[PDB]
Amino acid sequence: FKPEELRQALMPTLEALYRQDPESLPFRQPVDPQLLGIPDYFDIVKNPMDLSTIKRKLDTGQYQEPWQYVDDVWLMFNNAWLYNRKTSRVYKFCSKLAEVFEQEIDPVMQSL
């Protein structure tokens, strides 16, 4: 993969996540434990991740191969499933994003 070429493969999968409204909204910026009133968040989630950080990394050439991008998308979902209760709104939003991602990322992975 070459840098332009990688963005063209991965960006549609990231746009598909941003397109989910309202489900993507809580993921469009880093979790802010003090704004939200969840000060234990960083005690549970060691390595935070969100759509704005993934987008910045993709735009600036920080991913060289699809697996590195996939790792950060996974990490964003895994953190939200770890911290939030299974019947909570944010957990269900996370699951919807993950279902979209599973579909959108598959053609990229099958091409490798």
Ligand SMILES: COC(=O)c1c[nH]c2ccccc12
């Ligand atoms: C990714 O967002 C979370 O994990 C959140 C946890 N509680 C929240 C309340 C409002 C918005 C986001 C979150």
